[PDB]
Structures are given as structure tokens and as C-alpha cells.
């Protein structure tokens, strides 16, 4: 989020000659490891007369 | 009145030989008496005169 100025006026005593308070704020974005895998099972005689 | 042979127990050991366990073992015949051929995989044919 990003802070708003404002147009200021020139008094002592009246809330348009105030200077108005504002603020930034951040957020988390994130990043989470997930796993993905397959197995793959196979005949030893296969394996062996290829 | 009497020591028994249960009345010493564990006084008299027991005990052990090997003597009767070998078995002397013994392989196939088929590979003593006939030709071998080292196959590479599952299927090997041989043609004959019929």
C-alpha cells in the first residue's frame, strides 16, 4: 500500500491547516518446497536381457 | 536321604559334538555330463536338419 499527500492550507486554529499523518504497509509472499515423484518398478530379468 | 541326579542340577553339564551334522552336498548332474552354453538374454534359437 502507498501513503496520499494532501493539499495543506496556512491556520493556527482550523483542521485545514493541519498536515495530514499517512502510511506504507508490506505484505509476505511466499515460497513453500513441495514434493512431487514417481516410481517406476521393472522386472530384473527385463533389465538384465535388454 | 540321598543326593539324586536332579539334586545336582546344572553341577552336571551336558554336552555337544559336531561329529554327525556334515552333509556333503551334491550338484546337478545335467551340468556334469552335457555342454553348457552362456545364453545373453531370454530366447536363443538353433536350427536343425529335419
Redesign the interface.
Given at each position: 500500500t502507498l501513503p496520499g499527500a494532501s493539499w495543506v492550507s496556512e491556520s493556527a486554529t482550523e483542521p485545514e491547516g493541519v498536515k495530514p499523518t499517512s502510511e506504507a504497509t508490506w505484505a509476505d509472499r511466499t515460497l513453500v518446497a513441495e514434493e512431487v515423484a514417481v516410481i517406476i518398478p521393472v522386472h530384473e530379468?527385463v533389465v538384465d536381457?535388454a | 536321604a540321598d543326593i539324586s541326579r536332579s539334586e545336582v542340577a546344572t553341577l552336571i553339564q551336558e554336552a555337544y559334538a559336531n561329529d554327525l551334522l556334515a552333509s556333503a552336498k551334491k550338484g546337478s548332474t545335467v551340468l556334469q555330463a552335457f555342454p553348457t552354453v552362456n545364453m545373453g538374454?531370454?530366447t536363443t534359437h538353433l536350427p536343425v536338419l529335419a
Open positions: 530379468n536381457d | 538374454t531370454k
